[PDB]
């Protein structure tokens, strides 16, 4: 009789016609990716389109039920998920134009090709060509040519398309009662209607700024060390007090510094940890890798995996008869069908990737009892953090010693853990300034805070101010370097990686405290600990039925992001770093440029 | 002597839908129970008042057998005192139950590719189901304060089909349930074992 009962009944019809259509769709996507044919593309399309039509009619009805007359928080959350009309508010022709712009941008990025002047017919793709051209080669000129060619050949194409994308996304966001598209993106971290647990959308900006201000000393010490190493490797191209050229960061866009490990290793004589020799010694395979990782997950108290996971999920290359795309993914088809798609090789990296993917699967199984709308992580950063803490625990020397991969006569020394922590910082710390840089620029370009005539001027200025990276060659306003990234040109929020980086170490410290661990955090393991697994499950089972602040507090005891665990993790590395940088200049100057002659 | 239709009810080819469960009233029998164990490795042989291992030497009046098909998650709802979708609108056991259910997994006979939409269940009902009462009516469900005239915004069809596929978890898998309910009353009894 009341609006609450009508909403309850409505959400049941949805929560039960939705599971069926998502299965018939997720199954179509799964068997398309596992077996690429054209019949399978056509099946995926029909099923996905039926899914979308269902969601749209259900959204017109949910619009019908007002949100101001609902007391139950769960029903409010479910309807708010349903009532989000997205881009349907934008008119039909403008919606078509926005879709065409998104598709054209993604296509241009996908088939981007650069042709060297020595042979017009000889051109290389970004993947896997330019990636290996500029991620392995130590030549300054070839790296500069790859960087400049890729940017001048995709950013110039993507500039007007990105302008139209910005305009139409801003119009849609303003039509959806948001101030700009950045506000729409930040709307995920928004929780309201709870006393003391609310989180405004600008609170996210303020929090991320404070955490970056806290992180900056570690990053600048790491940057000073990396600059010294590169200046040793590139004698006449890097100034000691300047900034690293954008293309000398071991990656296409400088997102990750992991490729600098060969150049910036602390101690080059200490053997690095590698169990691949033991993998090929004991004749391990995909099945053994996944069984070992499952036994690890059982050791912490989390349950076994369903038999259907072993029966139908493929874990190995299926020959050459049928081609399959196997980017490592954890599929939650719904109704109990949890499957994993990744081409497992006998490698430690694949071992940790299997651990991460099955952590994702554990998360999916945890909240299977929640209604359909709430079957997801509390925010966009929880899934990857939950998956990655497992990989952090699985890489520890104690863990690999327990499994038998490392001989017990292995000598653990301070130099080995310094090397491990430096590799982690290159992978983990080195991407936080870039992620914050990119998301801040996207926010200030969606909000209209920077004019179109200074998209690139402001971008490079604030990149040199934040990340400490200068361009090797001057760029005019015709280029669209931010659009050259995968996530920017495919409409993906990027701060999820920053929040994941913070949450993963918060969770690691919270679990390691519960595992009565003694000593440094970077050595810690949660295996054979039922208390830590119970604590993690207490948040995993929630899903997103409760505010992410409450889910975070249920593990770490805090209602917001804090950075202290991240420095507690890197404390030995930090001390070694700041001991090394006594003869180097920390910080940087924004005036110096490679092309200033 | 006097064989019993227990084999017949346990080995039918299609077990009815849960909202229209199939009930048979065994009255004249010898009540043999050696043939009960060998049917399948039953998923839930939970007995509610009679010695399950030794059911013989006890004489009742009538034995009702009720055949369903329900999900694995909903098997735990078939018990004297549970509440939920099935146990409120489809099949409710009496509080003073005397007898016991027998549920086993049937995925090679009750699920097909592209969904098996031949098993239904009621999810919307104006009142909870009283014990051993079945309602097969498919009348529309008015969930709002407005006279409804068919499926629309605030008016839903009650029955919702069971999507069964051979690729679903153990809890969403088609489970065949046979509930045996014994009634004893002051009357000439016939069904019991020696
Ligand atoms: C992949 O799909 C094609 C077309 O449906 C089919 O002929 C082939 O057998 C499939 N490969 C498998 C099932 O391994
Ligand atoms: C919302 O409804 C569900 C089911 O009707 C119930 O379990 C939950 O406690 C309700 N929430 C509140 C805050 O009462
Ligand atoms: C299922 O979990 C139990 C409890 O730890 C374990 O003993 C058993 O080995 C697991 N199943 C398999 C197939 O490993
Ligand atoms: C976990 O427990 C098992 C069985 O007690 C043992 O074999 C294994 O070495 C333990 N691992 C760790 C890391 O303690
Ligand atoms: C049911 O009976 C048929 C033949 O009457 C037999 O083939 C089948 O195995 C029986 N099923 C069970 C479960 O006993
Ligand atoms: C059980 O199913 C049979 C098969 O059609 C039917 O003849 C019988 O009437 C059903 N029992 C009922 C509806 O009580
Ligand atoms: Cl760049
Ligand atoms: Zn992941």
Author numbering:
A (entry chain A): 19 to 615
B (entry chain B): 333 to 482, 484 to 527
What does the publication say?
KP.2 and KP.3 carry new F456L/R346T and F456L/Q493E mutations on the viral receptor-binding domain (RBD) of the Spike glycoprotein compared to JN.1, respectively. Mutations observed in these lineages, especially F456L and Q493E, are located on the interface between RBD and human ACE2 (hACE2) and are shown to affect the receptor-binding affinity and substantially escape the Class 1 neutralizing antibodies (NAbs). RBD with ACE2, particularly the synergistic effects of F456L and Q493E, we constructed recombinant subunit proteins of JN.1 + Q493E, KP.2 (JN.1 + R346T + F456L) and KP.3 (JN.1 + F456L + Q493E) RBD and determined the variants’ structures in complex with hACE2 at a resolution of 3.30 Å, 3.30 Å, and 3.29 Å, respectively, using Cryo-EM. Consistent with previous reports on earlier SARS-CoV-2 variants, the interacting residues of the three RBDs with hACE2 are comparable, including Y449, N487, Y489, R498, and T500.
However, the interactions surrounding locus 493 vary between the three RBDs. In JN.1 + Q493E/hACE2 complex, E493 of RBD forms one salt bridge with H34 and K31 of hACE2 correspondingly, Y449 nearby forms an H-bond with D38 and Q42 of hACE2 respectively, and R498 binds to Q42 of hACE2 through two H-bonds. In JN.1 + Q493E RBD, F456 maintains the same conformation as in JN.1, hence E35 forms two salt bridges with H34 and K31 in ACE2, further stabilizing the rotamer orientation which points to RBD E493. As a result, although substitution from glutamine to negatively charged glutamic acid enables two salt bridges, the electrostatic repulsion E493 of RBD with ACE2 E35 places E493 in a dilemma, resulting in significantly decreased interaction. Out of the four single-site mutations, the most critical one is the L456F with E493 (JN.1 + Q493E vs. JN.1 + F456L + Q493E), which exhibits a huge ~10-fold KD drop in SPR experiments. Although the F456L substitution alone does not affect hACE2 binding affinity and Q493E diminishes affinity, the combination of F456L and Q493E shows a surprising epistasis on RBD–hACE2 interaction.
